[PDB]
Amino acid sequence: GLSDGEWQQVLNVWGKVEADIAGHGQEVLIRLFTGHPETLEKFDKFKHLKTEAEMKASEDLKKHGTVVLTALGGILKKKGHHEAELKPLAQSHATKHKIPIKYLEFISDAIIHVLHSKHPGDFGADAQGAMTKALELFRNDIAAKYKELGFQ
Numbered sequence: 386g387l388s389d390g391e392w393q394q395v396l397n398v399w400g401k402v403e404a405d406i407a408g409h410g411q412e413v414l415i416r417l418f419t420g421h422p423e424t425l426e427k428f429d430k431f432k433h434l435k436t437e438a439e440m441k442a443s444e445d446l447k448k449h450g451t452v453v454l455t456a457l458g459g460i461l462k463k464k465g466h467h468e469a470e471l472k473p474l475a476q477s478h479a480t481k482h483k484i485p486i487k488y489l490e491f492i493s494d495a496i497i498h499v500l501h502s503k504h505p506g507d508f509g510a511d512a513q514g515a516m517t518k519a520l521e522l523f524r525n526d527i528a529a530k531y532k533e534l535g536f537q
């Protein structure tokens with residue numbers, strides 16, 4: 386649950402992402418894959434990537450980064466009223482991709498890391514607080530659907 390002022394911070398930060406969605410999406414996935422190499426094994430189309438240089442050179446990884454952040458941005462713009470947008474993603478990630486909630490924690494922290502890396506000194510403590518709360522809400526509502534499905 387976020388206040389109006391917190392949502393305003395989230396959507397202000399998101400403007401930074403929308404200026405370069407592919408570059409942000411690429412770096413988020415690279416941070417996930419290099420920090421948590423077990424996550425790469427869930428992607429049949431990226432498991433061939435052995436080095437970060439190959440990851441950086443992969444145009445399909447940048448494409449998928451655009452898909453991921455476009456979906457997340459659509460959810461964030463609903464300011465919590467995201468049941469219709471979130472349900473299909475919860476279902477596909479639990480039942481088809483088999484993504485444990487832990488990996489959603491990993492990618493949430495990766496987003497925070499990338500924002501500081503690309504905007505050092507321009508991602509203030511209030512903005513980090515609000516973005517963190519928004520990603521916690523996203524993860525918590527996914528977790529509720531995971532529990533319904535019995536997925537661990």
Ligand code: HEM
Nearest residue numbers: 424427428429430452453456457474477482484488489492
């Ligand atoms: C912010 C969190 C995430 C968002 C918004 C997101 C979004 C998406 C979307 C929109 C798709 C394509 C449609 C679909 O299959 O539902 C997708 C596919 C997929 N996601 Fe995610 N995802 C997220 C996190 C993760 C994480 C953490 C993992 C694994 C560590 C993951 C694994 C996958 C896989 C394996 C696919 C299929 C890729 C393919 O072969 O095309 N997702 N995701």
